Amino acid sequence: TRATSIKDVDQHEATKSIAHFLKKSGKVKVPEWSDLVKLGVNKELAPVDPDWFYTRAASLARHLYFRPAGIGAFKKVYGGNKRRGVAPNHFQTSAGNCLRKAVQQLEKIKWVEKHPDGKGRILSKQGRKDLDRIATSLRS
Amino acid sequence: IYNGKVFNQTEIKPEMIGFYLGEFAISYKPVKHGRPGIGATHSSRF
Amino acid sequence: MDKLTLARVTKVIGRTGSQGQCTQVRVEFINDQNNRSIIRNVKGPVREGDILTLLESEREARRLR
Amino acid sequence: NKRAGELTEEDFDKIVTIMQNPSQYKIPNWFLNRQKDIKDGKTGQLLSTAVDNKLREDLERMKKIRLHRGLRHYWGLRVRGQHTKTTGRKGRTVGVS
Amino acid sequence: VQSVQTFGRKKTATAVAHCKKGQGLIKVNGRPLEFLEPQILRIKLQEPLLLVGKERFQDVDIRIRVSGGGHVAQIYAVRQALAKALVAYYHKYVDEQSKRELKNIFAAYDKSLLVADPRRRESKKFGGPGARARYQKSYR
Amino acid sequence: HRIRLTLTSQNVKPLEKVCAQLIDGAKNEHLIVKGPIRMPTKVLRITTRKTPCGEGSKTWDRFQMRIHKRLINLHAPAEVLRQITSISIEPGVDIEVTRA
Amino acid sequence: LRFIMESGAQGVEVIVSGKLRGQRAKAMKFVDGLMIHSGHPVNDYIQQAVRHVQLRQGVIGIKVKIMLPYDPRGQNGPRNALPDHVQIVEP
Amino acid sequence: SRVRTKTVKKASRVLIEKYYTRMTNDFHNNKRVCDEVAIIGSKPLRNKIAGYITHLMRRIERGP
Amino acid sequence: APEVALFGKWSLQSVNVSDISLVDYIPVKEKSAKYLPHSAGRFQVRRFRKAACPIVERLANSLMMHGRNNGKKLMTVRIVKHAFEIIYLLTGENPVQVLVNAVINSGPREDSTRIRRQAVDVAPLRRVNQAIWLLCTGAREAAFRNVKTIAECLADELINAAKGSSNSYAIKKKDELERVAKSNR
Amino acid sequence: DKLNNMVLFDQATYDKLYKEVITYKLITPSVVSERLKVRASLAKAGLKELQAKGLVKCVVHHHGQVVYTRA
RNA sequence: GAGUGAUUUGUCUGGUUUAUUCCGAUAACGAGCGAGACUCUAGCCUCUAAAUAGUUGGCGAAUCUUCGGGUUCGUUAACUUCUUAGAGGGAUAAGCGGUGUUUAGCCGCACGAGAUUGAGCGAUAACAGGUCUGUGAUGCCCUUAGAUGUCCGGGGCUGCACGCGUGCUACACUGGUGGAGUCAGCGGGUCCUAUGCCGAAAGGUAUCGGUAAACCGUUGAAAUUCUUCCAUGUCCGGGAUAGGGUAUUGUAAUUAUUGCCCUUAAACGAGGAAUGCCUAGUAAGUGUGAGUCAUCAGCUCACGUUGAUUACGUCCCUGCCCUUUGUA
């Protein structure tokens, strides 16, 4: 009766499973500098996990399941508080290249179309299918 | 180079390429201190 | 060494102390055949029916003027 | 995720080689602390005593050419335009009379 | 079509609960009650069910739409809306005796389960950083 | 077609009086009038130092102006609008018609 | 003051400040009738004006405040009575 | 606090003297009769007058 | 009606307050049996309204001090839950009972005031308040700049206070206060 | 005096962990580190080892605290 | 009325009130201002309405499904619960108990959303208080072209042995670091800028929409929540100081405008004598908006989010109010 959609399961497990599936598919092309960059100015170090690209793409897909968005919107989503040293902290947007590349990879995998009104990206006819299948696989 | 009051004479060496002219004509005078006066501190204010 | 005496607060005389932090209270001993009543100085908020635990009960506070 | 004490010597030689020649191992020029050197024009990373040596050389160059920044450096004052009226005091209080 | 609509309020968070004849469904913003953040404030959402009884909850489908405020405020608004929706359903489609029993149980446990807490932020006043606090005074 | 009457003011009483006059006219004419749609009020705040100098305690004047907006939707191709609009006027309220 | 009071005002206050007599400035205040100072009804019942006069010695400031009368017809004053004035309908 | 000002007291006295017949012991009734018998410029003021009128009625019943 | 258990793990109806004085000032059972120690209630509108706030609620409220940690009631509730779990895992009886015993044992029964001082008795409400404050302060001081976590420090403080051993900061402070007051009699 | 805490287990500390630690009623990285003079990270890593081997029951597994008990 | 008079009484013995607020007594009677009332604001609830707000459906569509349901778009009717803003109601010491001078009121209970929400206004009489540097507000004095008018080009207002005030950042596991997951409000815009594409970032580039409940924008803010590593080490706390490179504003950036990348990484181990602010959605923590604004916020004016400990008193300190009293 339950666990027929992404909203019906824990989002931590959901994004974990989405990243696992995306890695297994092997159709995602991780960018060359993946192990060379920070995910935003507010961050101090590069990601600890070498596979951070797959996790970021999984998070992007999971959020697109909830609401259509664009690169700037996802920059706000993944941005955070930046410590300016001796000055007080302030909000800072994340980088943009990583989100753009992940979204383009999802489009390649056919998990993301463009909004019919041409105002961002929406989870695809196949993206919804795949994500709901992952959710019902989570089940329990 | 005018420093606001006078023209400081300066020869342009090859070492000054890539620098502003004003950086070689100081506009102020280095400070040498003078035994603080009455208003300094709070004991001498009276 | 005076037995721990538990006394209920029958009524509150009024505030006292340099800054009015203490309260004068009339207290009635709980386990007491003669039902002993005295006046004590208390710290902190106290109301009627509160049970105080006097370490020694021979002392009596001076009545408020 | 491993303590440096568990690491063998050849690993350390590998790492130092990468550090001395970052450009060979696809480390971009924007990742280095000495890019487009004012004298040589090379882009490299200054390691160990090279950092102190280059700092000394830069200060000497600026002072010798009598740049405003060099003069302030050699006088011992702040060089980035900070106010020096109240902060930066590391001396002894001086009385009046 | 047996259906009622109620609302719970707290600070600025407001939750609107639609309760209709159903098969024992509890949804908030499309997510199950067991996957809401923060995790510690989940027994708060379960308190209505625990106190009143799931036996008298499985007959309804109740969907809650919460917006505004923060996480704690939204949790409290959601629980209040849940209780009020159940009471309204039992007032409009069940006997007043069960209505009174429901109200008695909820009120006896917690008064805030049924009536909104009126506390709201007090406006800041110049000369200080907040409503009552004042900037430090230097007397010399 | 949909005629949009937008009425704006800084005072509620004249604005409501004009709205009521227009609704009464439309009803009398037997028109398809859509009730007064009340837009959120716009509050323009100016907080200023009371003193013309820098002396004294820091006291502030909190001036504010309020703007209220009303919308009316009409289905009226006939010449009746000009009559209804022209008859009812009131100072402080500005009206305009749009052919949406 | 006399003209304003005869015109029907509840009260009037006229203040003239400046170098009226001698070098040191002074303020002269003339009050007649009853006048309110605080509250919202001030905005409705009180009418104020300020002006300046340049005489040989300097500038003199004039302030005039008039408390309008309760006019039910809304011509000589506010149409609404004072909030604290309760009027009784005679039986 | 809860001390009625001379405005409220005088209004209540005048209303009781002039409309004793319409003044009953019920606060809602006194409020209603005040609404129609007096022009009061503030609802809180009217409610204060009605409350003090009820309080006065309670004493009038007991004695002069 | 179902029985209410704190955190759905600890029973309240089996808890007893030894001090008849503090029976009416330590709310645990009956109307005070609340599932979570996080209830957004107004316990300061009147004087003694705070006496009805659940004791675990009071502990959580007092743990969120030293403004570095101001407003973090959720973190403090997590700390309390972990500490209670450690209490049960270490001693064997109800952690809420252990907390009640610690509160009963940590309250000074006589103090000093400026009326040189004068020895005075302590009202039950202030007794409970000071017990809670002393326990929380001891846990905080023990945890500061230590490998031991705040939860472990709180667990140790509560266990020592409940046992009455002169190792808890709260018991030591209580003894200090009573001894000074006795000297000042 | 500084805490000279080792970063990786010595053999004596290792068999000490495998013999006596499993016998404690209360098992946490802090207490284990205090007892065996090891870093808390190493203590908790060894505790995951013990949990995987099944010699300890995990009771609390928060990111800010982990607690184990004898099995 | 009392005094030759300056002046008194009214304007009080007493009780009460935040209150010269009331009761009452009364050589005074009758009044005014101030207080209160009042305006805005916060609740909580019933009539008006809502193709610039939304719901309940109905109808198509596309996913999953444990087959009974769940999620999801694209839309023609019913309705205003939610949203908005008009009109009203509601709370006042009215009801019960006690107390009080058959008062004024006070305490508790009940009913309740609420049994003192916060602001604005704010009297007589004064200060040699600040402002001539806000003003085509201004007397007098000075100056009026080798100008104290105005403009133009540079420099300064930032200059540093030192003392003081308001602040920001920290001193750490109630933590920092890499992830993952999510909740605002006040309000702003011709300038906000969506969305594509480029770039490691900063930012660049083509421009949708909006002069606005229509677009920015469902304003995806932080603190906070769950996980990973680090574990008492000045270290993965702190990020001052300094070197190199690099974007953008602007005629111009040196005395670094600001931001971005790498590197350097200081004092600080909870702060002496002293001293400030604060009673509930408050303190404290946390970020956002606006003012300033070509660029520059650690400042101010507001907004929400998380949310307490303590007291419900006293006149001891610092002061204020009223009366009597003494005064060179």
Curated annotation (Swiss-Prot), chain C:
Top-rank lineage group of the source organism: Eukaryota
GO molecular function: structural constituent of ribosome
Record's keyword terms, sorted: Cytoplasm, Endoplasmic reticulum, Ribonucleoprotein, Ribosomal protein
Natural source organism: Caenorhabditis elegans
InterPro entries: NA-bd_OB-fold, Ribosomal_eS28, Ribosomal_eS28_CS
Lineage per the UniProt record: Eukaryota, Metazoa, Ecdysozoa, Nematoda, Chromadorea
Name used for this protein in its record: Small ribosomal subunit protein eS28
Chief localization: cytoplasm
One GO CC term, this protein: cytosolic small ribosomal subunit
One Pfam family this sequence matches: Ribosomal_S28e
Quaternary state and interactors: Component of the 40S small ribosomal subunit.
The gene coding this protein: rps-28
Entry similarity comment: Belongs to the eukaryotic ribosomal protein eS28 family.
Compartment(s) of residence: Cytoplasm, Cytosol; Cytoplasm; Rough endoplasmic reticulum
Keyword Ribonucleoprotein: yes
GO biological process terms held by the UniProt record: cytoplasmic translation; maturation of SSU-rRNA; ribosomal small subunit assembly
Keyword Ribonucleoprotein among UniProt keywords: yes
From Swiss-Prot, chain H:
Protein name (Swiss-Prot/TrEMBL): Small ribosomal subunit protein eS17
Recorded coiled-coil stretches: none
Family membership noted in the UniProt record: Belongs to the eukaryotic ribosomal protein eS17 family.
Gene behind the chain: rps-17
UniProtKB/Swiss-Prot annotation, chain I:
GO cellular component, one term: cytosolic small ribosomal subunit
One Pfam match: Ribosomal_S7
Superkingdom to which the source organism belongs: Eukaryota
Keywords: Cytoplasm, Nucleus, Ribonucleoprotein, Ribosomal protein
Annotated localization: Cytoplasm; Nucleus, Nucleolus
Keyword Disulfide bond: no
InterPro entries, alphabetized: Ribosomal_uS7, Ribosomal_uS7_CS, Ribosomal_uS7_dom, Ribosomal_uS7_dom_sf, Ribosomal_uS7_euk/arc
Record-linked PROSITE patterns: RIBOSOMAL_S7 (PS00052)
Gene Ontology terms: biological process: ribosomal small subunit assembly; ribosomal small subunit biogenesis; translation
GO molecular function ontology, one term from the record: structural constituent of ribosome
Quaternary structure, from the entry: Component of the small ribosomal subunit. Part of the small subunit (SSU) processome, composed of more than 70 proteins and the RNA chaperone small nucleolar RNA (snoRNA) U3.
Stated role: Component of the small ribosomal subunit. The ribosome is a large ribonucleoprotein complex responsible for the synthesis of proteins in the cell. Part of the small subunit (SSU) processome, first precursor of the small eukaryotic ribosomal subunit. During the assembly of the SSU processome in the nucleolus, many ribosome biogenesis factors, an RNA chaperone and ribosomal proteins associate with the nascent pre-rRNA and work in concert to generate RNA folding, modifications, rearrangements and cleavage as well as targeted degradation of pre-ribosomal RNA by the RNA exosome.
Family the entry assigns: Belongs to the universal ribosomal protein uS7 family.
Protein name: Small ribosomal subunit protein uS7
Gene name tied to this protein: rps-5
From Swiss-Prot, chain J:
Coiled coil regions, renumbered to chain: none
Full protein segment contained here: 38 to 108 of 117
Chain's gene name: rps-25
Keywords: Ribonucleoprotein, Ribosomal protein
Domain of life: Eukaryota
UniProt-recorded Gene Ontology molecular function terms: structural constituent of ribosome
Family label: Belongs to the eukaryotic ribosomal protein eS25 family.
Organism: Caenorhabditis elegans
Keyword Nucleotide-binding attributed: no
GO cellular component terms given for this protein: cytosolic small ribosomal subunit
Protein's recorded name: Small ribosomal subunit protein eS25
UniProt KW GTP-binding keyword: no
